[PDB]
Amino acid sequence: ARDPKHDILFEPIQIGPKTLRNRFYQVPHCIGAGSDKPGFQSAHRSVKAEGGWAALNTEYCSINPESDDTHRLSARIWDEGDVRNLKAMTDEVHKYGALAGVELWYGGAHAPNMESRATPRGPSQYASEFETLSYCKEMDLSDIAQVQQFYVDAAKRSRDAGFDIVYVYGAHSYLPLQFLNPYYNKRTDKYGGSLENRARFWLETLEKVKHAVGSDCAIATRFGVDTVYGPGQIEAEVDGQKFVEMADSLVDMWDITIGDIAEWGEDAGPSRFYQQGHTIPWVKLVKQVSKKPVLGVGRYTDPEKMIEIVTKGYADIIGCARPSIADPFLPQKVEQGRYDDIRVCIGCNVCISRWEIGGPPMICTQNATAGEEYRRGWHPEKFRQTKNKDSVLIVGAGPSGSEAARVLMESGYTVHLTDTAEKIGGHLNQVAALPGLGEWSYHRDYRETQITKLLKKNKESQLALGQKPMTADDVLQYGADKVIIATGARWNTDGTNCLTHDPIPGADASLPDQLTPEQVMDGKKKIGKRVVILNADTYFMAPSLAEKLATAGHEVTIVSGVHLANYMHFTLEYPNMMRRLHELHVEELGDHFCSRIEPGRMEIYNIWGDGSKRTYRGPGVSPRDANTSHRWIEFDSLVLVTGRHSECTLWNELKARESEWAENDIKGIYLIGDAEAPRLIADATFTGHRVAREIEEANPQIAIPYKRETIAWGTPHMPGGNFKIEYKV
Amino acid sequence: ARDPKHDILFEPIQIGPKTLRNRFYQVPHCIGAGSDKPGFQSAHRSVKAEGGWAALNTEYCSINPESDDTHRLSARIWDEGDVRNLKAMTDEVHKYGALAGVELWYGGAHAPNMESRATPRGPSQYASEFETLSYCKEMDLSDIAQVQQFYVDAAKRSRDAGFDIVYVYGAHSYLPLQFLNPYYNKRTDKYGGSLENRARFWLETLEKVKHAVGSDCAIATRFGVDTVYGPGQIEAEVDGQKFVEMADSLVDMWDITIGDIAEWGEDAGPSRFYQQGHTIPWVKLVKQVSKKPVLGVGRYTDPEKMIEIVTKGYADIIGCARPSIADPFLPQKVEQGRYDDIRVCIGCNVCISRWEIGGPPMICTQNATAGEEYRRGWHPEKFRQTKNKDSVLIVGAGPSGSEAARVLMESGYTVHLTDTAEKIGGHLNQVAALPGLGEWSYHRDYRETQITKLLKKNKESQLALGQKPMTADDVLQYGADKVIIATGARWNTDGTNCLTHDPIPGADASLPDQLTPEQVMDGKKKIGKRVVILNADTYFMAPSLAEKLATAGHEVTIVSGVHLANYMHFTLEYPNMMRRLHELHVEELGDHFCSRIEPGRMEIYNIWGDGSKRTYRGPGVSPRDANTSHRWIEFDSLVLVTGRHSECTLWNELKARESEWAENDIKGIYLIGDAEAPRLIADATFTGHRVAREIEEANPQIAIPYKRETIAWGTPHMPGGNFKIEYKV
Numbered sequence A, B: 001a002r003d004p005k006h007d008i009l010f011e012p013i014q015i016g017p018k019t020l021r022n023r024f025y026q027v028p029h030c031i032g033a034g035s036d037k038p039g040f041q042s043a044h045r046s047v048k049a050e051g052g053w054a055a056l057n058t059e060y061c062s063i064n065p066e067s068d069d070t071h072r073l074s075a076r077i078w079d080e081g082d083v084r085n086l087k088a089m090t091d092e093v094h095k096y097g098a099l100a101g102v103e104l105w106y107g108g109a110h111a112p113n114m115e116s117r118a119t120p121r122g123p124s125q126y127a128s129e130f131e132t133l134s135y136c137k138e139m140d141l142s143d144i145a146q147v148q149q150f151y152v153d154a155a156k157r158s159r160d161a162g163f164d165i166v167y168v169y170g171a172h173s174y175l176p177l178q179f180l181n182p183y184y185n186k187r188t189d190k191y192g193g194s195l196e197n198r199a200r201f202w203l204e205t206l207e208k209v210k211h212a213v214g215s216d217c218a219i220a221t222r223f224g225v226d227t228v229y230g231p232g233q234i235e236a237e238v239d240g241q242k243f244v245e246m247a248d249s250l251v252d253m254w255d256i257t258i259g260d261i262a263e264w265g266e267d268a269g270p271s272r273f274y275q276q277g278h279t280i281p282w283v284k285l286v287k288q289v290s291k292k293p294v295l296g297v298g299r300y301t302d303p304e305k306m307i308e309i310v311t312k313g314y315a316d317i318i319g320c321a322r323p324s325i326a327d328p329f330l331p332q333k334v335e336q337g338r339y340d341d342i343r344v345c346i347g348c349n350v351c352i353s354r355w356e357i358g359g360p361p362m363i364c365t366q367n368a369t370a371g372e373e374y375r376r377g378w379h380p381e382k383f384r385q386t387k388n389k390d391s392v393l394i395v396g397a398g399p400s401g402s403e404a405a406r407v408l409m410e411s412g413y414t415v416h417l418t419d420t421a422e423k424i425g426g427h428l429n430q431v432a433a434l435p436g437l438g439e440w441s442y443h444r445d446y447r448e449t450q451i452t453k454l455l456k457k458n459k460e461s462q463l464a465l466g467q468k469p470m471t472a473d474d475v476l477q478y479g480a481d482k483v484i485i486a487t488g489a490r491w492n493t494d495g496t497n498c499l500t501h502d503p504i505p506g507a508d509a510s511l512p513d514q515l516t517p518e519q520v521m522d523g524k525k526k527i528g529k530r531v532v533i534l535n536a537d538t539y540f541m542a543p544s545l546a547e548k549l550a551t552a553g554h555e556v557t558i559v560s561g562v563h564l565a566n567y568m569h570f571t572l573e574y575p576n577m578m579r580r581l582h583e584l585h586v587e588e589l590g591d592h593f594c595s596r597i598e599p600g601r602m603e604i605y606n607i608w609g610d611g612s613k614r615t616y617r618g619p620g621v622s623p624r625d626a627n628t629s630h631r632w633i634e635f636d637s638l639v640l641v642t643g644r645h646s647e648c649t650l651w652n653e654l655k656a657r658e659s660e661w662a663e664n665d666i667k668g669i670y671l672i673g674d675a676e677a678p679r680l681i682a683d684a685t686f687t688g689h690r691v692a693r694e695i696e697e698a699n700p701q702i703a704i705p706y707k708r709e710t711i712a713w714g715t716p717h718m719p720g721g722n723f724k725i726e727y728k729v
């Protein structure tokens, strides 16, 4: 079944003392587990091992508590307690015949150290451009020797934990790169100035780590070969290549990236800006000068692209982070020729966003089991089979409905999925037509393909699209045992918003000079020259519409009561988005909202317009002086992006008539997705996945408990430590 | 020794079936521990129990997974794993004869549920004004019964964990208050409309909880009596007093607050805006209509104010959160008449800022042991006494040096503290003179009072202020065994900033039209009419300086290459700070920085002015189109607020001459505080505290490990559960 052209992907490659079983490599990446959630870490990486990935790597792994990333979650290899938690992972990926790697990390001032409160050290004292209140101490020669010893000690504990590959991590502008890069390194001693001096710290660390564990472990390094800032930081054909020549003999394998830390969306390229293989112009520069295996991520999901870069001599190994999150069995599907079962990463970066927010576990828009493998026992490729003949009617074929259909069908149920829309995908069909978001299609392409394939396996299963809207009676009299309502949400038409929770006087999207997103995207309702987009949403909709409208020749002003595109900080889209709105001359009026709308004009006010002093003036009167900042602005068309509401009128009717359910042999009706409450596409598809996994539980409407990975009082993290309160007195 | 006037404070008061041993009450408050850090929770509350606080409450405690505050950290009472972990705290506070309380919490859409992924429910569907992407499902009567049962179950688990006081939490606009408040509740049935219908959810929940555990536990309710938004939300003389009259027979004690969730800085009132007793005008109103014990927080630190609100009949009990964080032993000190040993909270809200950031443990600017009680065994009031007669010279009497001196003197060392300054307190003496920051003085007032006190305990110790600056020779010949350099930081004079890490061409604070923060605060140098403040710092200096100058009749523009006053989001100062700048007509030009400065004018650019498309154009040329936004703006004076640098010249010289230490019998020299790296006042204070505690360690420059509270792989959180991966197949 496998096209023999793909056979190269399954040749083994020696990395130092080790052998990769094939050319599929999961580069180090955060998942929100670290050494704190050992089951999560263990399960998420081991399912990938059984899925065929040659090597699995932890995320950035702190070598010492003065590189503590709290509030974000890194791995830590500080002590014996970590060695045991991390070993859970290496044992479990070894079980399925894969290598395990750890990415040794020291952050410099980029690590805020909010747990440890320790002082970070660096080449020169600087305030981090990422963590702008975090400063570091300039290292003296002893600081340098001590921190190099941190690396050696961590490498040894890594061998103890059972790791096969040990990185010294100099990508994303972390310590080794801070020495190499003059942007940080202002020294004038033997560690500063010339390339040879600036390369010195990394070189010395490499051979010290190699000396400590090089016999048992492959020594890899992760290198940001170009900071993509131009002259002034690392350029690939200046320092980048010359450094690779210097260090080549010490490293068993090169793992290449581009970009810095403040803008690491240049590495993890959103599909909004970057296509698969976006990194190739920089990555290939390395294989030019290296004599060792190199790999370089580039959101590779397509085996034709994978074989192109290997045979064209751009890379030897296929490095993946996100592709491996979206589909842990990518390599097995390619090997077996099941190319149409490949769940393709859509480059949305919602997995990243959870880490960036600092704390929460990762989630994935494509793969609703990511982060759920251990806590709820959900294997992405294995499904409990039903022992009964229950049919299920799903009304709504959007992200949630289509996912519930797919999982149910995989579990052997008989399902009837219906929609008024002619195509599976729900609102995602409109969203993927926004400028830049075309690859978000892959979400609904995947369920379409899977659902049509699965239909052939149960002939009682039906797909009824292009339908007439289901009614309460239609549902009651349909004869399904269970019904899942996945009818979605729409954008508010009356100015209702998270700020007031009330409509705005004069807001009415049926008026000729007011549009909703849906009206804009259907492209029928005419839009005048001067557009104002009123915004109370912090994600993609208002910026995407602004771009769309400005490139169509409108003059667009966003007046935004919330921080525009805030969530796009976390997905890493923010910087290029702002640059994009800027070059399109989109005017932004932040910290303003709307008190009333008339034809062709609206009254706006500053949200900080009230008196700063609070005085008790009794009931009936505000405790602050009045907001006096109101002014009118004109528009030709007003686009309302104020919030969404659940489309649950069908559900409500069905619930009203719950008495009749039993009469009609309906065992239960459940509400999922945006029809329950508007949410991220990722979580909409999760709800469909969850009710499908749990449809035989007592109440599939509410999730059953998941395994919790929190400390049990009475059990010390330190092997053989004392857990009780002891004062140093 | 205790003033007889203060005898009331130590009278017992009966709340339901329970008796408070005195009038000091720690209301529920976050600490970044929850049920995840059982030592931290246990240690922090019990040192307060031992300090004489009558009752100690957890922070907000989730009753169910669908009210999950991740990425922030709440307590949880979901299962038996939690009652084990939380029982650790109640056992320890019981050890000291105090009551333990728990605050049962359901948040509605305000809880983003980033761990559980569950769906919140509320009175109506709204997007949270606090979590703008978080929506809830509108409850039906079945949902309503199901959620009220969550409370009952949590209250029974609480009783099992050994809690004496069980709250139904209706403050900070959480679920019970959402039903009562028309801002959220747009219902039309018997849970909406009239006050009777609106108070229905809370009354029902109080009755069921009472019925469940009211026999064994006092039943309290924490109520936001006025949303301080005026008409449209809860007003104290309208709905507030009425609801109190309705619920009065169900509750054993009223715990009263004001304000909402988006702006609970109105509750936790910063000293920048509010004084001790600021809440009284609202709190006293509940006392008018209630027959139960009432307490209402108001940053109460002064026993004179405490007896005032009790004797005037505003409150029966003294409820404190921050005062108890800054001084766990406030009750004992008042009891014993040690009034001048009280470590007064400065109302800086840095403790809060850590919880708001989401994840990190609490820290306190006054009390360097808050958060460190369990992990490093630091009791705020007990110090290990030295066995030797070592003498320590400390140069610098700022937050770090004065804390090192204080703790060293407490431990029995001979210390010589010296500064060129006339007063103890370092840079905090300038900072406390910024508009609104006068109470930040208490940090140096406290340390001045304690050092003066400790000097009498040891004749050889010495405070020398107003001195010549210490010189490397001075230190070497001084005759101290160990030396601590605590010489601070200063604001940059050359435009060096976190964005570029380099000077700005033309930046020179020696020129007559450029000022630093110190020069403005000294007030000697002349400032012209039009002032531009160039900002690259995300905390208080720029907005405070802007306030100061604007009030003095200057025209102020802040051009800010970072998010202005970003950190004040977390300290809760931001809303009222922005209103203040607004009424002072301060112009803010965000998303801009400065390429170069000339006399009377500076060139600024948009930080998003580079082209959005990245293309490899080879070395020497930027991969983005050039920023073209540069324009010149004029000023009469330019205030530079771009960053700070360590003042470590003395340190550097001493390290250069390390070979001379031994012959001068200097056993060690240590660098602490801002001189090591610029930091928050809280952490400057901590570094001094830490070297003092660890001065006999092998290397006092670097902290020794603290106890970690992370799960140990192999130990299930669920008592009797399985920790191994198990897939449901």
Ligand SMILES: Cc1cc2nc3c(=O)[nH]c(=O)nc-3n(C[C@H](O)[C@H](O)[C@H](O)COP(=O)(O)O)c2cc1C
Pocket: A027, A028, A029, A030, A031, A058, A059, A060, A103, A171, A222, A257, A267, A268, A269, A297, A298, A299, A300, A319, A320, A321, A322, A323, A351, A352, A355, A362
């Ligand atoms: C959720 C997430 C977290 C990441 N954290 C890390 C990390 O800990 N260490 C690291 O070296 N890179 C980190 N990365 C970057 C990836 O290793 C990788 O370079 C990026 O995802 C681009 O590769 P892709 O296009 O194959 O996803 C992270 C990426 C993701 C998806």
Ligand SMILES: Cc1cc2nc3c(=O)[nH]c(=O)nc-3n(C[C@H](O)[C@H](O)[C@H](O)COP(=O)(O)O)c2cc1C
Pocket: B027, B028, B029, B030, B031, B058, B059, B060, B103, B171, B222, B257, B267, B268, B269, B297, B298, B299, B300, B319, B320, B321, B322, B323, B351, B352, B355, B362
């Ligand atoms: C660090 C911190 C976290 C807080 N979290 C809570 C909480 O979980 N529950 C609650 O009801 N109030 C919370 N608050 C508010 C306090 O209970 C209190 O009402 C507020 O700080 C004002 O009281 P004070 O002036 O005595 O500090 C918190 C306050 C602080 C200081």
Ligand SMILES: Nc1ncnc2c1ncn2[C@@H]1O[C@H](COP(=O)(O)OP(=O)(O)O)[C@@H](O)[C@H]1O
Pocket: A395, A396, A397, A398, A399, A400, A401, A402, A418, A419, A420, A421, A425, A426, A427, A428, A468, A469, A470, A471, A486, A487, A488, A489, A647, A650, A672, A673, A674, A675, A684
């Ligand atoms: N009564 C109905 N009958 C059939 N399909 C319906 C009905 N009401 C809504 N739908 C469909 O439900 C789907 C909901 O999709 P979507 O909004 O994407 O929600 P989600 O994100 O929850 O999957 C839409 O394709 C819509 O056409």
Ligand SMILES: Nc1ncnc2c1ncn2[C@@H]1O[C@H](COP(=O)(O)OP(=O)(O)O)[C@@H](O)[C@H]1O
Pocket: B395, B396, B397, B398, B399, B400, B401, B418, B419, B420, B421, B425, B426, B427, B428, B468, B469, B470, B471, B486, B487, B488, B489, B647, B650, B672, B673, B674, B675, B684
């Ligand atoms: N050479 C010196 N001799 C004596 N005192 C000094 C010397 N250099 C600086 N100082 C003092 O050190 C103190 C530093 O305090 P501060 O800046 O508040 O630092 P921190 O916040 O680290 O405590 C200042 O009061 C300063 O006058």
Ligand code: SF4
Pocket: A322, A323, A325, A326, A344, A345, A346, A347, A348, A349, A350, A351, A352, A363, A364, A365, A366, A367
């Ligand atoms: S969350 Fe989005 S970007 Fe991340 S792996 Fe999943 S589909 Fe890809």
Ligand code: SF4
Pocket: B321, B322, B323, B325, B326, B344, B345, B346, B347, B348, B349, B350, B351, B352, B363, B364, B365, B366, B367
């Ligand atoms: S951190 Fe600040 S506001 Fe909080 S308890 Fe301490 S001194 Fe008070």
